[PDB]
């Protein structure tokens, strides 16, 4: 309706870049080209593996793929499953002879995609949102997370012209810039209707 993306205004503010490489003019369009074919591809295997973010910097003809996760025991595989296999991709189709860096951020029900994609995993399970929202709001209210704002998109229950949702809770001061909001929309492909989700999480003043 009438908004700005709460990351896009705050990358110039204390919320940092979730990818930051550098180059010059001619290769300036071919580098984030390579950075896109890994970010569409790391979703394709690390989907159930509790994916959080993907960070890419270019120190010298290499990318430091700094994967942030919360369930790393399934990410590693058979202790060597995903060391060179996920450096095999970046060598040619990204053109980057690079290394891999997996790392866990804890609290696996508090990151933006995690609160988002769990409800999708509960709506791919097709449980009642009226039982799903009311608990998955308070998972954030359990482990801290000073404020939440969760809108579930329509085509919910039996309807073809549906409504929106809210559960506003705590405090979500996104109109004030100094509020480091871990926001990430997701999408859940229930058969009738694209049931989407918008998740605002406030991780403390700075």
């Amino acid at each position: 309706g009438q908004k700005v993306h709460p990351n896009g205004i705050r990358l110039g503010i204390v919320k940092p870049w979730n990818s930051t490489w550098f180059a010059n003019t001619k290769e300036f369009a071919d580098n984030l080209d390579s950075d896109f074919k890994v970010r569409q591809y790391l979703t394709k295997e690390l989907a159930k593996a509790s994916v959080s973010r993907i960070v890419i910097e270019r120190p010298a003809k290499s990318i430091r793929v700094t994967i942030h996760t919360a369930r790393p025991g399934i990410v590693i595989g058979k202790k060597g499953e995903d060391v060179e296999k996920l450096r095999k991709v970046v060598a040619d189709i990204a053109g980057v002879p690079a290394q891999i860096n997996i790392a866990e951020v804890r609290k696996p029900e508090l990151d933006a995609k995690l609160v988002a994609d769990s409800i999708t995993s509960q709506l791919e399970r097709r449980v009642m949102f009226r039982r799903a929202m009311k608990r998955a709001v308070q998972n954030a209210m359990r482990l801290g997370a000073k404020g939440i704002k969760v809108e579930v998109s329509g085509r919910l229950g039996g309807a073809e012209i549906a409504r929106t949702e809210w559960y506003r809770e705590g405090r979500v001061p996104l109109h004030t810039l100094r509020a480091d909001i871990d926001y990430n929309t997701s999408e859940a492909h229930t058969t009738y209707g694209v049931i989407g989700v918008k998740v605002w999480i406030f991780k403390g003043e700075i």
Binding site: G8, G12, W21, F22, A29, D30, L32, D33
Partner: protein, 96 residues
């Protein structure tokens, strides 16, 4: 995007410089002011289907033609959405 243009994308981009990176040097004196003959003009358009003035600079990762950008190699809504996901490094909203 006219998804069949992603067929005709490479067909109009690749062979443009795979024919006219070196063959333009092969005739680079004659029609220029250095002397004018028709054998180079027969060399010029004995085929037609190679053209380095046919590339419309289609967008990179989803291919929308309009609103393309020179520096970024991306178009109208994709420059926005990559800047909103933080996919573009060092790029905030312009304000001064």
């Amino acid at each position: 995007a006219k998804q069949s243009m992603k067929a005709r994308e490479v067909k109009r981009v690749a062979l443009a410089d795979k024919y006219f990176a070196k063959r333009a040097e092969l005739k680079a004196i004659i029609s220029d002011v250095n002397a004018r003959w028709n054998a180079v003009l027969k060399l010029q358009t004995l085929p037609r289907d190679s053209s380095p003035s046919r590339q419309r600079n289609r967008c990179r990762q989803t291919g929308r033609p309009h609103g393309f950008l020179r520096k970024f190699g991306l178009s109208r809504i994709k420059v926005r959405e990559a800047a909103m996901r933080g996919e573009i490094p060092g790029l905030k909203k312009a304000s001064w």
